[PDB]
Amino acid sequence: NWTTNLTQAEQLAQLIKEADALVVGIGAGMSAADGFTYIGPRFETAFPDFIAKYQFLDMLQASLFDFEDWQEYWAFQSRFVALNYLDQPVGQSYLDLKEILETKDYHIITTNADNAFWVAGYDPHNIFHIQGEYGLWQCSQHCHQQTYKDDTVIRQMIAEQKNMKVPGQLIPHCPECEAPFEINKRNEEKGMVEDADFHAQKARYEAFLSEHKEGKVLYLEIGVGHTTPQFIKHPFWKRVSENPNALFVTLNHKHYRIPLSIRRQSLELTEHIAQLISATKTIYQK
Ligand SMILES: NC(=O)c1ccc[n+]([C@@H]2O[C@H](COP(=O)([O-])OP(=O)(O)OC[C@H]3O[C@@H](n4cnc5c(N)ncnc54)[C@H](O)[C@@H]3O)[C@@H](O)[C@H]2O)c1
Ligand SMILES: [Zn+2]
Numbered sequence: 266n267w268t269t270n271l272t273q274a275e276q277l278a279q280l281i282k283e284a285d286a287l288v289v290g291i292g293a294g295m296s297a298a299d300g301f302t303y304i305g306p307r308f309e310t311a312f313p314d315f316i317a318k319y320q321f322l323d324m325l326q327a328s329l330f331d332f333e334d335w336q337e338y339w340a341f342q343s344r345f346v347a348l349n350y351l352d353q354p355v356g357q358s359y360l361d362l363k364e365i366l367e368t369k370d371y372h373i374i375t376t377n378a379d380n381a382f383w384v385a386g387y388d389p390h391n392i393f394h395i396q397g398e399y400g401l402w403q404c405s406q407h408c409h410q411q412t413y414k415d416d417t418v419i420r421q422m423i424a425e426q427k428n429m430k431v432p433g434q435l436i437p438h439c440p441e442c443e444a445p446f447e448i449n450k451r452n453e454e455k456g457m458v459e460d461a462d463f464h465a466q467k468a469r470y471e472a473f474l475s476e477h478k479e480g481k482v483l484y485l486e487i488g489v490g491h492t493t494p495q496f497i498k499h500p501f502w503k504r505v506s507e508n509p510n511a512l513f514v515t516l517n518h519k520h521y522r523i524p525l526s527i528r529r530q531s532l533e534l535t536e537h538i539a540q541l542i543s544a545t546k547t548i549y550q551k
Contacts, residue, residue, distance in 0.1 A: 266279065266283050267280075267283050267481055267510075267512070269512055269513075269514075269529065269530060269531055269532040272544070273534045273535070273536045273541055273544075274536075274541060274544035274545045274547075274548055275548055276532065276534070277514065277516075277534060277541070277545045278545050278548040278549040280483055280512065280514060280532075281365060281369065281483065281485075281545070281549060282549065283481060284369065284481050284482065284483035284512075285370070285477070285480040285481040285482060286369070286370045286371065286473075286476075286477045286480070286481075286482050286483070287366065287369050287370070287371035287372075287482075287483050287485055288371070288372060288374070288473070288474065288477070288482060288483070288484050288485070288501070288504070289362075289366070289371055289372070289373045289374070289485045289487065290373075290374050290375070290376075290484070290485070290486045290487065290489055290497035290498070290501055291373060291374070291375040291376070291377060291487050291488065291489070291497075292375070292376050292377065292486075292487065292488045292489035292490060292497060293376070293377060293488060293489075293490070293492070294487065294488015294489065294490065294516075294517060294538055295356075295358060295359070295377070295381075295487045295488040295538055296356065296377055296379055296381055296488070297488065298356075298358055298488060298537060298538035298539040299356030299357060299358050299359065299381075299539060300356070301349065301353060301356065301379065301381070303323050303324040303325050304322065304323035304324065307324075307348075308321075308323060308324040308327075311324075311344065311348050312324070312327065312341070312344065314428075314429055315327060315341055315429065318429065324345070325492075327341065328341075328342070328345055328450075334430075335436050335445045336430040336431050336432075336433065336436065337429055337430055338445075338447070339422055339426075339431040339435070339436055340422070340426040340429045340430050340431045341429070342447075342448050343419050343422035343423050343426070343431065344423055344426075345399070346399050346400065346419050346448070347419065347420075347423055349378075349379045349380070349399055350378075350379055350380045350398070350399040350400045351380070351400070351416060351419065351420075353379055353380050353381070353384070354384065355381075355384040355385050356381055356384075356385065357539065357543070358538060358539045358542045358543070359381050359382065359384075359385035359387075360385055361542045361543050361545075361546040362487075362542055362546075363385055363386070363387060364546055364550070365542075365545065365546055365549050370477075371391065372391055372392075372393070372469070372470055372473040372474075373387070373391055373392040373393065374392075374393045374395055374470055374496075374497060375392060375393070375394055375395070375396075375497075376395060376396045376489070376493060376496050376497060377394075377396070378394065378396050378397055378398050378399045378449075378450070379399060380399075380400070390469060392466070393466040393467060393469065393470040394463075394466065395467075395496050395497075396450070396451050396457075396493075396496070397412075397448075397449035397450055397451060397457055397463075398449060399448060399449075399450075400414055400416065401413065401414050401448070401449035402414060402415075402437065402446040402447065402448060402449055403446065403447060403448075403449045403450075403457070403458035404439035404441065404442060404444055404446065404447075404458065405439070405444045405445050405446065405447040406439070406442055406444040407455060407456070407458050408439060408441050408442040408444065409439075409441050409442075409458075410458055410459055410460050410461075411458070411460050411461075412449050412458060412460045412462070412463075413437075413446065415437065418435065418437055421435055422435055474504070478507075478508060479508060479510065480508075480510055481510055481511070481512075482504075482508060482510070482511045482512075483511070483512050483514060484501045484504055484505055484511060484512065484513050484514070485514050485515075485516070486498065486501055486513070486514070486515040486516070486517070487515075487516045487517075487538060488516065488538055489515070489517070490517070490519070490521070491521065498521070501513060502523070502524055502526075502527060505526075505527045505530050505531070506524070506526040506527050509530070511530060512530050512531070512532065513527055513530055513531040513532070514531070514532045514533075514534065515531075515532075515533050515534070516534050516536075516538050516541060516542075517533065517534075517535065518535050518536070518537065518538075519535075520533060520535075
């Protein structure tokens with residue numbers, strides 16, 4: 266039973282049923298599987314002006330670009346926040362996953378910063394947004410550990426911008442140091458503003474892990490790649506190595522080489538995440 270000839274969905278369903286607890290790591294693949302993609306027509310349709318000017322290949326690259334000024338930065342980011350946070354509809358795979366998780370003891374860690382868990386109605390106390398959220402702002406100088414939000418201003422920036430610039434007076438500023446706000450995002454050089462809410466999520470996640478150091482714990486990694494493996498992928502590998510009774514299951518249509526220590530505790534399921542989660546739900550429910 267607890268081991269790594271069945272379909273992928275059958276195998277996953279059985280493992281979930283058997284597990285004492287689930288630690289679920291969710292990356293960009295899960296949102297891309299529901300159509301919330303960062304390259305191709307979705308990106309091209311939303312940012313024809315920015316693409317024509319800078320020859321951006323994809324939306325992740327664009328979102329990290331050092332724009333000429335803050336007027337251009339906010340012209341891009343306001344539209345980016347609308348597409349991926351304010352107006353992004355619920356994804357069916359997030360609903361399917363939620364139905365499965367209802368009967369399990371679980372916690373989610375995610376590197377995603379979109380709205381996907383909120384529009385799907387997950388309990389915020391069960392989710393750790395380790396890379397922040399696009400709907401939040403931070404001081405560009407990180408002068409104090411507090412995040413801010415104002416969706417009304419985001420809408421005004423979309424409405425009022427022209428020729429890829431927001432009007433000067435709409436750029437929001439840090440009330441402590443007067444530097445411009447930027448999106449709450451993590452950066453290798455500067456890090457990320459990590460406020461009281463962030464630390465509360467982190468503590469909740471860490472408490473869950475402290476409770477499940479032993480037993481049949483399923484570390485379920487969904488749509489996590491090589492862009493930032495230090496957040497979910499590597500820590501999960503280490504957890505599984507540390508607990509001989511744990512399993513590592515990754516839902517990814519690409520194969521990432523698993524370390525020697527956990528070769529016997531690993532399963533890789535390659536089917537398209539959306540279809541896989543859907544078929545697993547159907548089997549699990551019965
Ligand atoms: N939705 C978001 O919020 C978003 C989107 C892009 C990037 N980011 C940021 O950039 C980094 C991205 O890293 P990452 O590891 O999350 O993503 P990644 O792009 O590095 O890896 C995504 C993985 O999912 C797989 N995948 C994609 N579609 C799939 C499908 N239909 N079925 C099965 N597998 C599929 C890919 O093969 C890939 O291995 C994160 O740190 C994050 O903060 C966030
Ligand atoms: Zn400041």
